[PDB]
């Protein structure tokens, strides 16, 4: 497992809608 | 003060003044580099930056390189901003101020930084050692102020008046119309600098071959080799240098560089070997020198050498048009040697 392989955050990552409204 | 230029449809341009001086002509060893780092600042006419930051504000940058015999000053600008840059460059090339209290803080820390970052790499040290041991106190000299002698501002000014002069000068810029420069130097202070004498050399510099040196650097080992080349037969060493450095011959995956530094009337064929260990280097250089001394046919690289030489040129001051047709063979004769890093394992000159 090389360092570039970012661990799976999919459990905690926000859904596929970016965050351009979450700042609000 | 003969000038030359070339016209270009492209709308970016740069002008260069090629002072025919540098390390070779320095009376004291560590003055050429310090002068060059002392060059673009604090004119008597206009301030060091209060009237040179306006160059960047106006769309162009300044650069003053160094070499073995060229104190080159360059400036890249747009097409419509030429006369101001010619005037500023002539003003800096006017031995203007050389203020005394602007050396202990301005350039010396820069000189120390430059020396420190240029001495870590053993390649540069090998080049310097090879030049010094091959040319003595003639062409060769320490390219960098290492502080071995105290050099005084009087000596800097003396060197500047020795080299910066109208007769021993040359100006060339690209993408600039010829008439503008031909009539703009005369409308500038470059018509007023005293006429010194051309510091060129009539005959070849005296060379010394056979001797070797060594040091005890802490790091990767390097085993430089050098040859002296004269102007009469300089094509063969260039074609051989490119033959070695390329992937055409098997001696490619171990050598580091095989450049051929060019002077007015001669040069030093160099090459390098370097590795992390201190045992592979010995065997590698042993087989390299054995095979070179064996004598290799060299013609089937002429086209590659011609292409690399042509693509190498970017300056208007084209070097002499070498004749790449009278190359038929090669057999190594007598050479030189420098060893850097560890010495206890590197081979001596006798058994090489």
């Amino acid at each position: 497992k090389s360092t570039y392989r970012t661990p799976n955050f999919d459990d905690v990552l926000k859904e596929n809608n970016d965050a351009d409204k979450g700042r609000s | 003060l003969t000038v030359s230029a070339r016209d270009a449809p492209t709308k970016i341009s740069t002008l260069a003044v090629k002072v025919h001086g540098g390390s070779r002509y320095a009376t004291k060893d560590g003055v050429a580099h310090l002068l060059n780092r002392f060059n673009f600042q604090n004119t008597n006419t206009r301030s060091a930056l209060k009237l040179v930051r306006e160059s960047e504000l106006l769309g162009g940058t300044f650069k003053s390189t160094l070499d073995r015999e060229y104190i080159t000053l360059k400036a890249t600008f747009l097409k419509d901003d030429l006369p101001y840059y010619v005037n500023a460059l002539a003003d800096v090339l006017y031995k203007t101020a050389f203020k005394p209290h602007e050396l202990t803080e301005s350039v010396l820390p820069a000189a120390r930084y430059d020396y420190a970052v240029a001495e870590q790499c053993p390649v540069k040290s090998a080049e310097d050692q090879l030049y010094a041991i091959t040319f003595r106190k003639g062409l060769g000299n320490p390219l960098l102020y290492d502080g071995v002698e105290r050099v005084s501002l009087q000596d800097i000014k003396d060197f500047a008046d020795k080299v910066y002069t109208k007769e021993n000068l040359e100006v060339s810029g690209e993408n600039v119309v010829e008439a503008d420069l031909k009539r703009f130097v005369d409308e500038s202070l470059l018509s007023t600098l005293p006429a010194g004498k051309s510091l060129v050399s009539k005959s070849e510099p005296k060379f010394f071959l056979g001797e070797e040196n060594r040091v005890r650097f802490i790091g990767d080992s390097v085993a430089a080799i050098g040859i002296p080349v004269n102007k009469a037969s300089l094509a063969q060493y260039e074609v051989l240098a490119n033959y070695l450095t390329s992937a055409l011959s098997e001696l490619s995956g171990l050598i580091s560089s095989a450049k051929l530094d060019k002077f007015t009337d001669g040069g030093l064929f160099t090459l390098f070997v370097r590795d992390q260990d201190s045992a592979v280097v010995s065997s590698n250089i042993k087989k390299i020198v054995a095979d070179l001394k064996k004598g290799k046919d060299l013609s089937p690289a002429i086209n590659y050498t011609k292409l690399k030489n042509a693509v190498q040129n970017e300056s208007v001051s084209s070097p002499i048009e070498l004749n790449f047709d009278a190359v038929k063979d090669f057999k190594l004769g007598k050479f030189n040697y420098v060893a850097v890093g560890d010495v206890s394992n590197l081979p001596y000159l006798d058994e090489l």
Binding site: S2, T6 | V52, L57, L58, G60, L78, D114, L307, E314
Partner: protein, 431 residues
């Protein structure tokens, strides 16, 4: 001296320039690191290396022509330089030893030797370089789970797990004719315009490139590799730039060039500059700048890379750079904008018009694939003088103000505060 483009099966472009006399002809494939999956990373690297070794040995020995290459994210710029009077031979070699046949090239012995050489090269790059490493890490952390974060070199685990079949499969899924062009930068006029289209001189594998399911995204992150063994420090901020083919490329480039580069150990750089450089120079804070705003066909990156020497004073360097970026988006002097315009003009002039034909050929290939037509620098100069303070204000109000950042550095970063001391201070609470 005008670039010509067309569309006859395979796109052929030409930037004639009888100034230089080093003719170059090659291909610019519109795929690379971005067009390939994480599990098989260094396939492009291996292609480039097998070429650059064995084909070099072939060409120099036979004829006179030195072949180069480049891969950045989605190029395989297999430019083959030559003499002005030797372009037909270069094209014949390129079409006889790159597209086909690949049997005389992919011998197991040559492939294995190149594989071990690539392993050694990537290893010592990992152990020696540093700014490039942190830049690659910045890409890999900005685009997690996206076919753009994977580096242009690869990982040893991904490098070792591929022999022949994967290489050939990628060749047949990306070396097509739909997204492959020919570039003839140098001093050729129309011989390349007609000789590329010949009885058989054409790339194999007709079809189309397999379209990626997802293109690109962004999210704030950190990848720090804190190790006190290394002497200096390394950091690289980042804010999502503007993709190519957008009415924001040049305004972003100017917004990056305002602050500009800086080398603290040069007599000709400390004296000049703008506010942050002076306020740093009063003490000793930093040792290098690089304001870079890189852009790609999917998304671009506006970055800020340094490699300092002081270790206790990281926080102050970051705080000052952030306050200066806020100053950029709140209020800019007209003279600053004018100076930036002039500097960026000269920088573009140097970059696009460097004497080396290979750089021009690669950039022309990039633009012709992405833009669809070359943008001659005359129009760039015409449209660059129109950039005005209001436009930059508007652009920075979008890309910069309170937008997620990504940083990634290797070295003695430990002094750097983690996230809320480098993110929630891009507005300084008084705009």
């Amino acid at each position: 001296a005008e670039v010509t483009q067309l569309s006859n099966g395979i796109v052929v472009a030409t930037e004639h320039n009888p100034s230089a006399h080093t003719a170059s002809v090659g291909v610019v494939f519109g795929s690379g690191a971005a067009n390939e999956n994480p599990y098989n990373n260094g396939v492009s690297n291996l292609w480039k290396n097998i070429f650059l070794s064995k084909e070099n040995s072939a060409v120099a020995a036979k004829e006179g022509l030195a072949l180069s290459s480049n891969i950045s994210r989605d190029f395989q710029s297999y430019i083959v330089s030559s003499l002005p009077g030797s372009t037909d031979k270069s094209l014949d070699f390129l079409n006889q030893s790159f597209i086909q046949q690949k049997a005389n090239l992919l011998s197991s012995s040559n492939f294995e030797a190149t594989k071990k050489s690539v392993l050694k090269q990537v290893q010592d790059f990992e152990e020696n370089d540093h700014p490039n490493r942190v830049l690659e890490h910045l890409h890999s952390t900005a685009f997690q789970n996206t076919p753009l974060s994977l580096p242009t070199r690869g990982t040893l685990e991904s490098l070792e797990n591929l022999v022949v079949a994967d290489l050939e499969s990628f060749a047949n899924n990306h070396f097509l004719n739909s997204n492959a062009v020919v570039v003839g930068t140098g001093n050729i006029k129309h011989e390349d315009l007609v000789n590329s289209i010949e009885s058989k001189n054409l790339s194999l594998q007709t079809g189309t490139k397999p379209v990626l399911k997802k293109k690109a995204a962004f999210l704030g992150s950190e990848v720090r590799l804190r190790d006190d063994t290394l002497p200096k420090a390394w950091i690289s901020l980042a804010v999502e730039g503007e993709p190519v083919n957008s009415p924001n490329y040049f305004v972003a480039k100017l917004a990056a060039q305002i602050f500009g580069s800086y080398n603290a150990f040069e007599p000709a750089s400390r004296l000049q500059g703008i506010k942050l450089l002076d306020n740093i120079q009063e003490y000793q804070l930093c040792d290098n700048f690089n304001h870079f705003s890189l852009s790609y066909k999917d998304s671009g990156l506006w970055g800020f890379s340094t490699a300092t020497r002081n270790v206790t004073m990281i926080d102050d360097l970051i705080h000052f750079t952030l306050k200066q970026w806020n100053r950029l988006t709140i209020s800019v002097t007209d003279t600053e904008v004018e100076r930036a315009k002039s500097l960026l003009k000269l920088q573009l002039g140097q970059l696009y018009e460097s004497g080396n034909p290979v750089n021009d050929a690669n950039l022309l290939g990039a633009e012709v694939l992405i833009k669809g037509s070359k943008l001659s620098l005359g129009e760039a100069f015409k449209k660059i003088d129109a950039i005005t303070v209001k436009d930059v204000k508007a652009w920075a109000g979008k890309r910069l103000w309170d937008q997620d950042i990504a940083i990634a550095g290797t070295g003695q970063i430990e002094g750097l505060l983690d996230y809320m001391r480098i993110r929630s201070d891009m507005s300084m609470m008084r705009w």
